[PDB]
């Protein structure tokens, strides 16, 4: 059975159904409600090398979607754009009436290759990836999403601002993927786990304001000198 | 059960977007034609953890996984809309299922008021 | 509350289709491959307007606008097809969707000829 | 709450949620039905040029589709086939299961050319498209459909003739639209609104037997000297 | 009525597939990603023909198909998946659609441990 | 009304609506079951000439599906690759989420050609064709299914092996239609109703260890000298 919340004696309890309480009053559907809750909320890592290792490519299970009503704003999302290396299309394109997720501080847009060993992506904690007030359990090509759970339960009777973060990535889906940050079309840094989405944001704009950007036509790739909290509380060298 | 919490962390806080139940638009709003576009048909809440709910539902949602992930893999349905009519449904026939036995357990039945008459 | 027409005019007659409710078939004519066309799967019928019912009906099905298309807006389903089946929920959840306090007001238990005993 | 009609004390009306009345019994399903009415049986305006300045194109808003069990026969019904002026579809193509209104006396057929700026074409009233036992919010495109309404409400426990008067149209879904009665491919008549079904018909009827077509290889085009009632109760002149 | 099997033949026993009712899985086998593919989700049953009940419903499903195609054919759904919620539903209204007469022969209400007060 | 199986004094019957008895009780939607049953289990004739003559094209009926959570194990199921002369594909592509049957002992593969006189392929007998927990009125191409029916009903409170035998169509769905069981790409056996699938088994094992298959590049074509009980109880000669 499908676990229903319910509020028993001042907390959030899971309803059994072996259990028939005549106090519990369900007067109408609007009571009923179903609740998207972002991976995010209970500490998972957030940066795009430790988010796409939780996602992976296999065949032979269709695909499956189910809304959910209500949903959590997210300070990180993904969109993704990967193809094989011949030029083929990795993910399916989003289904009619799937849009990208609704809330989102930051999307992180990931753009790259990768072999993409299955016919869809799935997630392999069995997480779910939520889109605009539909969770499916696959990822759909160029569609914002973030990772989540839903839940049922019973009722008793600033603005927002969202900012893109492009990446580029070789060996998507591999134990050997390679990251990088995109600047703009031809100024690119080395990425790993440590960076933050702010930080990167303060990269970029000081790359920008100290002209660290390539005045050439070739590409520039950068990494980075040094130089465990959650959010709601042509190579050369920068150090 | 009861919920145990065996997550990481918890964000106690729930900046939550939804769609309006009803809600009677102001003049024209209502017509989709003049309406608001996709982006911009949603209310935003903020709820705190009183009585514990936030994380509760944090784990809620997470235990809730499994079950549903089995029941998707049973349907033949692309796209599932029915979980919570079905659970009305049973709901109801929980209770009146069957014949109910006044004064039995699993009647929902009260003769207080005709018991002082 | 009770509807009101307002509207600049009133077809009071209604010439209406619809699709029969079953209707054991004349033979052969249920099987998909020997029955009917699209086309031709329609009932018709004529109703006049007495106690004022149609020109009510025009109205409600206008006033019902507003509040149907605010539904529409909310729900990510493409093709919506279970308003009545939630409708019929709601009916029985407003009787029995808690416990029956016999003699209530808002419990449809009839103890009469319970009482005669 | 989306209103639900009754019949109390010989009348209909709006069942009230903060009301329980235990004399009513809905006994089965098949008590509660969804009804579609047509504009028409309101005293709108159903000549083409007024018809058509009712919709208009709009983006950014998803198309939505409710059933309907029961309808009304149509005396005007309308299908539209309008492209942009360098040919493209202004209208998308009936999704599958999407059939024509079932019962029309009249089908205005519309071909033309229109700026379409939005990506689909909605009531600029709110009112509903509908279709064979489907309504939709938006128009789709060569699809008959009639102007209406959806009302739900719980029930207490000759022959069909159709006939088609094609238009042609310029600047469709504008302020400056103008219209052809199509006698044939090169014969037209100047239209307004004054203009019913059955005096096209006559007119149609009368140029044919009378030789006003054009007996030449060129287009042309008929304006009519003059020469509010509801239904249910090269160019050269003709005077 | 009784159902009367007026079948040629009849294969008294029945090898009968179908998918499990949750059944939570050993491990990590609910996960999509690691689960089974299509092919590999469905359980297995023998059933003989006690009661006659096989033989029974070999007739009751080809009873069936008329009404069915019938509704088949009134619906614009192009794909059904509520006939047993509404047959739920229907049941539920059948008994507790209008007010409950204690002791009547449409009222599921036994006032016997009560009549014992 | 759709009949509804109950199980009443040790016998299944149809229930009616037009009789409350309290005694049942349906205490969760666990207790409605839909099940599809196999025509094989009635004693149809399940021979590929037997069984395509049971089904036929027709135009203006949309196609219509309703689903089913348990079904039977099938003796024989069918796939069928059928085009017109020209080449056309005579059955729709199978829509998304419809896969075959899920338990076949034997797939009759029939690939050929035929007028095929009609939008879709229906039972002439009102049947279904069973597919993957989804019930059809029409046959998709390639796609495996078993001819069966659909009942309801309230529940009271070795291994799997398939093999696929191909045959070759000429005249599909008429009353002048001529089948080969094909052995290889160039032999053929003719065809009639008296044929059994492990009968039609052993003549290809036969024939293959015997030789008999053409060691030209031409097409052989084997017709049999002779040489009613349910399952579950360049031409030459054979004899
Ligand atoms: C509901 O909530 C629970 C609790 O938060 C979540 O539980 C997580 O479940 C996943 C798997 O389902 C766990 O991930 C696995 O971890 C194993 C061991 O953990 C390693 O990492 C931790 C740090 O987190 C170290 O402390 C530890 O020493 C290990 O080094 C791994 O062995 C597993 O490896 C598998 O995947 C990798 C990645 O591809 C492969 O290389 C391996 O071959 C192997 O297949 C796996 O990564 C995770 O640790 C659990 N977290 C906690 C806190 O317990 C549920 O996932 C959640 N439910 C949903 C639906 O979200
Ligand atoms: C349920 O039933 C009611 C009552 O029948 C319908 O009400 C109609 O609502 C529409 C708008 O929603 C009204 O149309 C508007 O009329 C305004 C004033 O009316 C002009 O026309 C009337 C003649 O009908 C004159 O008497 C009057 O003096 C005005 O000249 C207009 O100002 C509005 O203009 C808007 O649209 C135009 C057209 O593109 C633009 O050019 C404008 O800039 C502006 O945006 C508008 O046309 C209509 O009058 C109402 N009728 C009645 C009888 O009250 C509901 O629509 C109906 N519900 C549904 C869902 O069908
Ligand atoms: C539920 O269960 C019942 C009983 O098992 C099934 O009943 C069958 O119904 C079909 C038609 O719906 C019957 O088929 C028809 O048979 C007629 C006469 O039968 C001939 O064949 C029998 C041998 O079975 C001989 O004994 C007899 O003398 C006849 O020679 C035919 O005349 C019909 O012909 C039509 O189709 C043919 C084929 O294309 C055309 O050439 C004709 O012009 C004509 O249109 C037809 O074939 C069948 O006999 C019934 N069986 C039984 C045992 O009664 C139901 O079908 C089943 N329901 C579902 C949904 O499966
Ligand atoms: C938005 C509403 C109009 C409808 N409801 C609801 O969706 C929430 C309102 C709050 C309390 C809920 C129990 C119900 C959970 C809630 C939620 C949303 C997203 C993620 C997690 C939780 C937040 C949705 C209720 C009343 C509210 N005013
Ligand atoms: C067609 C039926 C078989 C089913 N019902 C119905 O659909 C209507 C029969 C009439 C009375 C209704 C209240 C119910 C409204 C009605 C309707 C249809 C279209 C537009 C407006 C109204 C007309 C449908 C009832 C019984 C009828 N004999
Ligand atoms: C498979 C289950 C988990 C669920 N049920 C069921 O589907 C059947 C279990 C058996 C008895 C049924 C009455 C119900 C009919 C049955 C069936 C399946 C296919 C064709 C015909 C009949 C067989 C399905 C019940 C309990 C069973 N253990
Ligand atoms: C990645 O996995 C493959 C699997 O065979 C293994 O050969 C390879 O050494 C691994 N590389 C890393 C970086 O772990
Ligand atoms: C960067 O490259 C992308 C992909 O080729 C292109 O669409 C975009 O216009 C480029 N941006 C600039 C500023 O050149
Ligand atoms: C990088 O900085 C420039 C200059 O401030 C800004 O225009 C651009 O949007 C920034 N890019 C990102 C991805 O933030
Ligand atoms: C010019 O090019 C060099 C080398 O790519 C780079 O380090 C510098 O930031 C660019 N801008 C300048 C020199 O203003
Ligand atoms: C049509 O509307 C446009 C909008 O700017 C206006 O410029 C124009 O004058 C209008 N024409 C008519 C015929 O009203
Ligand atoms: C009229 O024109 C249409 C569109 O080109 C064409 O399909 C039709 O056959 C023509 N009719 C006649 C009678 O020429
Ligand atoms: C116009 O009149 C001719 C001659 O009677 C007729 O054949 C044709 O169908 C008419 N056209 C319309 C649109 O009524
Ligand atoms: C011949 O052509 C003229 C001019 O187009 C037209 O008025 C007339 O009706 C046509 N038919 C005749 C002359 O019979
Ligand atoms: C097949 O049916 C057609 C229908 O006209 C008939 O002409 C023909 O003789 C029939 N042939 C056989 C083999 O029955
Ligand atoms: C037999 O023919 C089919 C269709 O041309 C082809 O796909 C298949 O490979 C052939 N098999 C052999 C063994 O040649
Ligand atoms: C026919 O026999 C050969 C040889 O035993 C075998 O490989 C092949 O699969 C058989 N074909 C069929 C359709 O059984
Ligand atoms: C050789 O060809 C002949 C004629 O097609 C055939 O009868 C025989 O089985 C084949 N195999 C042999 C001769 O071994």
Known sequence: SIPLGVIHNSALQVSDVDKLVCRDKLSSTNQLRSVGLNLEGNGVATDVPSATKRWGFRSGVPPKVVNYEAGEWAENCYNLEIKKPDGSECLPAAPDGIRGFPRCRYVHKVSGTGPCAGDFAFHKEGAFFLYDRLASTVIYRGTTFAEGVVAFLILPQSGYYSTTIRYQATGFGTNETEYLFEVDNLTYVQLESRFTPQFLLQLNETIYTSGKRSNTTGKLIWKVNPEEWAFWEXXXXXX | EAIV?????????????????????????????????????????????????????????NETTQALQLFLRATTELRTFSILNRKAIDFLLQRWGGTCHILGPDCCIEPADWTKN
């Open chain 2, 5 to 61: 919490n065996a997550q990481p962390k918890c964000n106690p806080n729930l900046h939550y977007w939804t769609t309006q139940d009803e809600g009677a638009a102001i003049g024209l709003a209502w017509i989709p034609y003049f309406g608001p576009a996709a982006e911009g048909i949603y209310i935003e809440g903020l709820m705190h953890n009183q009585d514990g709910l936030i994380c509760g539902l944090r784990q809620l949602a």
